[PDB]
From a paper:
DNA polymerase θ (Pol θ) plays an essential role in the microhomology-mediated end joining (MMEJ) pathway for repairing DNA double-strand breaks. Pol θ catalyzes the annealing of microhomologous DNA ends and performs template-dependent DNA extension. Distinct from its homologs in DNA replication, Pol θ-pol exhibits low fidelity and possesses TLS activities. In this work, we characterized a Pol θ-pol homolog from vertebrate Lates calcarifer (Lc), which shares high sequence and functional similarities with HsPol θ-pol.
To assemble the ternary complex, LcPol θ-pol was incubated with the incoming nucleotide dGTP, Mg2+, and a DNA duplex (20/29 mer) with a dideoxy-A (ddA)-terminating end, to prevent chain elongation. Final 3D reconstruction and refinement yielded two structures at 2.4 Å (complex Ia) and 2.8 Å (complex Ib). 11 and 18 bp of the duplex DNA are visible in complexes Ia and Ib, respectively. In complex Ia, the DNA substrate around the minor groove contacts the thumb domain. R2342, K2322 and R2343 interact with the primer backbone, and T2272 and D2275 are in proximity to the template backbone. The finger domain in both complexes Ia and Ib exists in a closed state with the incoming dGTP and one Mg2+ ion bound to the active site. The 2.4 Å structure of the LcPol θ-pol complex Ia allows confident modeling of the active site. The B-site Mg2+ is coordinated by three oxygen atoms on the incoming dGTP, D2463, D2664, and the backbone of Y2464. The finger domain movement brings R2512, K2516 and Y2520 to contact the triphosphate group of dGTP. The nascent base pair is surrounded by a series of hydrophilic residues, with Q2534, Q2517, and K2516 on one side, and R2382, Q2607 and N2603 on the other side.
Numbering used by the authors: 1979 to 2016, 2048 to 2073, 2094 to 2108, 2114 to 2288, 2317 to 2401, 2442 to 2639, 2653 to 2714
Write the structure that this text describes.
DNA sequence: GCTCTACGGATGC
DNA sequence: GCATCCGTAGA
């Protein structure tokens, strides 16, 4: 039955546990943390629990410790040897930040497996797992502590045995879905990479952020002065009611939806919608970036700099990775204040002293992925010759030379292309393009006619989703879309759009995770003596940010060239598609100041 | 009748 | 009285 052996109680017992632990091809590890403080070994993290089959759990107490932790480090760092933990990122970060132990080897996390089996479902707690997947272990839930009495050793042992059972069931479930090698070769190493990113943080100059904040606040005072002058009274710029009054009630064209439609037929008609738009953009910047970042900032003393530590979400409908605490991914790009000041929220994100930011983006990634999946011969030959499809779309749309395509113009062409691929209608295309309804419909017809393989892939993806109830990515991840067969046409169409989008975007996410893993492997081979993160303590790169197809690394100046070569090679060789996977590598003294490193 | 993500402020029942 | 909702930013 449910047993708790205390191996950290005798020399021979602990040594036998270690020598049996090394041989085991798969165990479950759990952390026992009595959190009187909210990162310390023997003060917060109290112990370690290890479970193999037959409802037995071995608890290693980290109280009194040097030799216990040394042998646990030896086994936990390359003892097979698969460690199963609930919330792998949390466990890895806690181990690093408390006792300086890095989980080296193959990891498994029942959370990641449950998300694999049904990514559109809810994040199941471990109890939630036991009730659903392992009902025969339900009597053990009384013993995962409680909100009042935890007993961290007993809670750890119960969680470890439950995680072992749950992952044993989920392993067979994943093999049935043919997602097991993908789980073990792609998904879990990506989890470790993300935890290592979370440990790294991203450098953050408070001085630069304070400078930007002061300029933005002076600009907001000026903007409020103009807005109260362009209207007449001192209304509220943060109230949609106080905006829909003054707007649409004196001379405008319409509650009333005072949204960024004030760009349309209002920005070129009255200057207050532009002033309101600028005020809203700077207010977004302040209240969603600089105020959160100035309160989320944390001083790294070893690096002698401030850093921001985001939390990776990773439980996503499509396999993407987002972040929680500051929401770093959505930090705005540069924009101009006239007083011309350049608000660069990314310019506040800086490397350590003597360091460089290295950012490697995937060139038109989902175009290439879709060209491979659809086998569209036209797109294959076009983008295998180094062409920029976004540039050519922008040129043929505007009639301008492709070489004279602006970066913002390229963004609109990119949005048009991806929207068309992902089920955008004629009305939305007309809005985003300026053309009429019929013109946008004919544009979509021409897009599907010249890229015949793309239309065939769209139809086949929807047909196979109806026939199977799910869609599959390039590397085998499935998403279930029960609305694909809904009688209501809106839910059915929504599921078809999600089917195509999930296929292509999940495949791109899979490629990006693979590239992250392979870059990490090559970096470890090239600089074996470097620290894994900024919390492990500088040679090589450090992976401070992930941008769904872009990997930010923060390398040393001397290692910049080698790191860029490594990153480019790994990103281009992640997957052998019918397309080439070109990566654009940029270097700079800051995230907001990056120059192309032609290499 | 583009998808995905989070998140501040405001509706909104 | 809080709970989502939505518009917003990235991608
Ligand atoms: N559905 C949709 N997906 C988008 C949109 N913008 C970006 N994404 C997805 C598709 C892109 O392939 C992917 C990576 O983002 P990027 O903006 O960097 O674009 P892409 O890689 O296509 O272009 P690039 O050559 O890097 O400029 O993100 C969008 O407007 N709609
Ligand atoms: Mg890209």
């Amino acid at each position: 039955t449910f047993s708790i052996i205390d191996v950290a109680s005798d020399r021979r017992l602990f040594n036998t546990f270690i020598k049996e632990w090394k041989t085991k091809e798969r165990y479950s590890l759990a952390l026992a943390c009595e959190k009187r403080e909210h990162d310390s070994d023997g003060l917060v993290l109290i112990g370690l629990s290890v479970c193999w089959g037959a409802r037995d759990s071995y608890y290693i107490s980290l109280q009194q410790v040097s030799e216990r932790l040394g042998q646990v480090r030896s086994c936990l760092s390359r003892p097979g040897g698969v460690v199963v933990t609930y919330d792998i990122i949390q466990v890895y970060k806690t181990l690093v930040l408390s006792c300086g132990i890095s989980l080296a080897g193959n990891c498994e996390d029942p959370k990641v497996a449950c998300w694999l089996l049904d990514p559109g479902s809810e994040e199941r707690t471990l109890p939630n797992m036991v009730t659903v997947y392992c009902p025969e272990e339900l009597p053990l839930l009384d013993g995962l502590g409680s909100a009042h009495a935890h007993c961290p050793r007993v809670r750890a042992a119960t969680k470890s045995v439950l995680v072992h059972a749950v992952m044993n069931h989920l392993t067979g479930l994943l093999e049935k879905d043919s997602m097991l090698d993908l789980f073990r070769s792609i998904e879990m190493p990506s989890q470790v990479c993300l935890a290592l990113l979370e440990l790294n943080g991203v450098g953050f100059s408070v001085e630069e952020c304070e400078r930007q904040k002061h300029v933005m606040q002076a600009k907001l005072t000026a903007l409020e002065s103009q807005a109260y002058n362009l209207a007449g009274h001192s209304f509220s710029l943060t109230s949609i009611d106080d905006i829909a009054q003054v707007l649409f009630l004196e001379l405008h064209l319409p509650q009333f939806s005072t949204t960024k439609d004030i760009l349309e037929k209002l920005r070129p008609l009255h200057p207050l919608p532009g002033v309101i738009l600028e005020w809203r953009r700077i207010t977004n910047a302040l209240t969603k970036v600089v105020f959160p970042l100035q309160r989320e900032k944390q001083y790294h003393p070893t690096l002698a700099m401030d850093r921001i530590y985001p939390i990776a979400q990773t439980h996503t409908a499509t396999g993407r990775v987002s972040f929680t605490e500051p929401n770093i991914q959505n930090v705005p790009k540069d924009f101009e204040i006239c007083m011309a000041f350049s608000v660069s929220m990314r310019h506040a994100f800086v490397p350590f002293s003597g360091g460089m930011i290295l950012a490697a983006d995937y060139s038109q990634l989902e175009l290439r992925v879709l060209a491979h999946l659809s086998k569209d011969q036209r797109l294959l030959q076009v983008l295998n010759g180094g062409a920029d499809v976004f540039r050519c779309i922008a040129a043929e749309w505007k009639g301008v030379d492709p070489e004279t395509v602006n970066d913002s113009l390229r963004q609109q062409a990119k949005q048009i292309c991806y929207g068309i691929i992902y089920g955008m209608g004629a009305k939305s295309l007309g809005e985003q393009m300026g053309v009429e309804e019929n013109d946008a419909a004919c544009y979509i017809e021409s897009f599907k006619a010249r890229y015949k393989g793309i239309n065939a892939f769209l139809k086949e993806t929807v047909k196979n989703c109806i026939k199977n109830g799910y869609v599959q990515t390039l590397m085998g991840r499935r998403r279930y879309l029960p609305g694909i067969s809904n009688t209501n046409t809106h839910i059915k169409a929504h599921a078809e759009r999600q089917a195509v989008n999930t296929t292509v975007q999940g495949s791109a996410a899979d490629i990006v995770k693979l590239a992250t893993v392979n870059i990490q492997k090559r970096l470890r081979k090239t600089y074996p003596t470097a620290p894994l993160s900024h919390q492990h303590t500088l040679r090589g790169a450090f992976f401070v940010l992930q941008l769904h197809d872009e990997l930010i690394y923060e390398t040393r100046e001397e290692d910049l060239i080698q790191v860029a070569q490594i990153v480019k090679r790994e990103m281009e060789s992640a997957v052998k598609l019918y397309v080439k996977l070109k990566a654009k590598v940029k270097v700079g003294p800051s995230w907001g100041n990056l120059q192309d490193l032609d290499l």
